[PDB]
Amino acid sequence: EIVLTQSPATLSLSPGERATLSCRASESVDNYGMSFMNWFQQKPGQPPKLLIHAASNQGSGVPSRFSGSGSGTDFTLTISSLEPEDFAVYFCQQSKEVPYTFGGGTKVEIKRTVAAPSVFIFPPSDEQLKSGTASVVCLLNNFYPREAKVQWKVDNALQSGNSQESVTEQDSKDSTYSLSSTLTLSKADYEKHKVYACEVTHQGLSSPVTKSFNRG
Amino acid sequence: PPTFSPALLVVTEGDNATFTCSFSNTSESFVLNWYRMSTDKLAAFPEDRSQPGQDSRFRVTQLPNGRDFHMSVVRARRNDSGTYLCGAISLAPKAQIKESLRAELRVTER
Amino acid sequence: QVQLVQSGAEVKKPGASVKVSCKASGYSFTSYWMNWVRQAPGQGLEWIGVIHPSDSETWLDQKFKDRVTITVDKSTSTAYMELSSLRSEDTAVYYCAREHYGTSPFAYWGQGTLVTVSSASTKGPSVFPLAPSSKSTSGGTAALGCLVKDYFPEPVTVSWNSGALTSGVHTFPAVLQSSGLYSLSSVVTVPSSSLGTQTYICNVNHKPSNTKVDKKVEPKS
Numbered sequence: 001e002i003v004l005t006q007s008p009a010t011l012s013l014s015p016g017e018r019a020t021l022s023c024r025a026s027e028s029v030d031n032y033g034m035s036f037m038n039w040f041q042q043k044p045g046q047p048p049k050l051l052i053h054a055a056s057n058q059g060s061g062v063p064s065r066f067s068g069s070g071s072g073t074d075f076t077l078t079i080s081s082l083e084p085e086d087f088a089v090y091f092c093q094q095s096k097e098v099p100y101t102f103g104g105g106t107k108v109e110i111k112r113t114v115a116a117p118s119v120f121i122f123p124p125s126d127e128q129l130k131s132g133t134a135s136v137v138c139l140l141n142n143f144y145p146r147e148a149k150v151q152w153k154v155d156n157a158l159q160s161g162n163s164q165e166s167v168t169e170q171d172s173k174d175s176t177y178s179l180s181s182t183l184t185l186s187k188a189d190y191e192k193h194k195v196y197a198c199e200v201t202h203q204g205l206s207s208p209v210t211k212s213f214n215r216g
Numbered sequence: 217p218p219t220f221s222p223a224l225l226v227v228t229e230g231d232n233a234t235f236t237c238s239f240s241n242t243s244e245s246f247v248l249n250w251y252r253m254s255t256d257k258l259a260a261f262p263e264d265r266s267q268p269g270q271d272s273r274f275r276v277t278q279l280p281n282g283r284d285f286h287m288s289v290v291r292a293r294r295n296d297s298g299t300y301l302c303g304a305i306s307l308a309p310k311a312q313i314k315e316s317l318r319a320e321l322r323v324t325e326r
Numbered sequence: 327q328v329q330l331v332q333s334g335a336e337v338k339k340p341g342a343s344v345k346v347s348c349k350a351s352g353y354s355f356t357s358y359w360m361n362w363v364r365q366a367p368g369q370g371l372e373w374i375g376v377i378h379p380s381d382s383e384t385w386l387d388q389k390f391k392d393r394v395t396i397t398v399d400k401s402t403s404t405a406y407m408e409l410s411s412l413r414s415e416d417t418a419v420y421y422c423a424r425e426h427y428g429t430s431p432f433a434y435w436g437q438g439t440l441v442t443v444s445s446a447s448t449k450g451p452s453v454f455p456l457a458p459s460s461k462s463t464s465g466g467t468a469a470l471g472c473l474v475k476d477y478f479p480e481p482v483t484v485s486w487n488s489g490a491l492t493s494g495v496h497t498f499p500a501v502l503q504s505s506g507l508y509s510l511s512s513v514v515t516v517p518s519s520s521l522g523t524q525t526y527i528c529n530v531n532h533k534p535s536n537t538k539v540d541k542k543v544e545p546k547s
Contacts, residue, residue, distance in 0.1 A: 031311050031313070032249065032303065032305055032313045033257030034249075034305065036429060038430050040432070046437075047421055047423075047436065047438055048435060050432060053429055054427070054429050056264070056265055057264055058265055059427075067265075091371060095429050095430060096311050097310050097311070098308075098373075098385055098387075099387045100361070100373045100431055100432070101373070102370055102373075104370050118464045118467070118469070119464075120461070120462040120469040121461050121462070122456040122457065122473075125454040125473075128452070128454045128475075135475065137456055137511055139456075139469055139471070139511075139513055141496070141513070141515060164509075165501075166501050166510065167499070168499070182501075211461060212461075213459075213461050242357050243358050247427065247428040304428075305428050307425055309376050309385050309431065311429060
């Protein structure tokens, strides 16, 4: 199979800027004087839409700003002036051979100034504890860029495998992200230690932020 | 496979030359390419994306009976003399070509 | 206009089979290859196989050769994809896609069919407060919320104060717990000066189980 490698994983740009996306193939896409490389745009909840085929030709109704180039094993999708409706995930895909294969995607996201997260910690409710489980929630509110690290420490022991994270899509008004980290323990395990702490690392924070509480 | 006619076309420098590629298509998904043997793609139908400041002497057009295509060269040159063919590109499902028999173009002085 | 309209979302137990429809219209059905592709949640795209409806010539990706059957019914211009011995990892959106421009297998796409493979039973959530506290304040702003825990299948909807508060609300995507049940939180930031006089209630609805829960969220004494 022909493996497609897209880069970069993410592009952070402003409307009006040029976006240049790369797709590298593990072997040549070309045959018969043509290049067998296709490009798609995909938004949340929707199927992909074809922008480019035979890896400079346009699909129907695709705006002029979308162009494809390259040959052999190296291809490029260019959006010469970004519009707000262009922030999407973009995929390349080859049709020279079956199986037909796709790259992993490049997310084109909205650039804005750095925003540190506001960090909040929530102890488990008394009602949940009565049911035999303790969920501890750590909220990282309204930050940019997306990269963030949340670590749970219980009586200063680093936790692993007992938490799950969820992230919102870029906010439509301020282009921030928000994230929740939920630490789940049985009530019996929860009552075995005193201090529950959430440690947040983000480039907008000169020092990581620790939020904590004493059980009980 | 498509047919490509006439097998021999002789024109004078500066003239136009037109071959006919007949291809019975089962669908609109095909690309019909015009090639010259060293194969080098000269033109396609549907035409490839246009680029400003880039003009071509080679064109492929579809005739109204839908089967026939004209492969036209304008302002023919001596070094255009050579071997040509058309091929239909489609999915096999893999990318596939069906080549016509070859035809010859000869461009003579005057 | 070329249109590909798929059948609706399905919830299936492991070991079961699912047969997805794609109804084609606006073109001559038997003249174009019809492909099937799937995408796992937050995941990239995987080709399953292809069929030419004129003679039902079929090519399958090796990964699916022994669980997938692709067929067509010419009389209704409908293509089908049947996936057997379903596993958790088959939870995905399944798409049909039609070729065009003689090299592009994927040029027109159906709207997708979500197939969720799970042993879980339909169950409404428990709703717990995320209390505003001295550990939930920043400046003149406080955060509070509701933890919507242990329900299946998706979705739940969350509103605040019966729709009267939408500013500053973040309702997170659900996560699938190792138990097989989903969980999510909905949070909102408000002025901390309001914490003593403003009532804050999250309104949770899960339609599959006919569960409606209104949970008041207040600072804890």
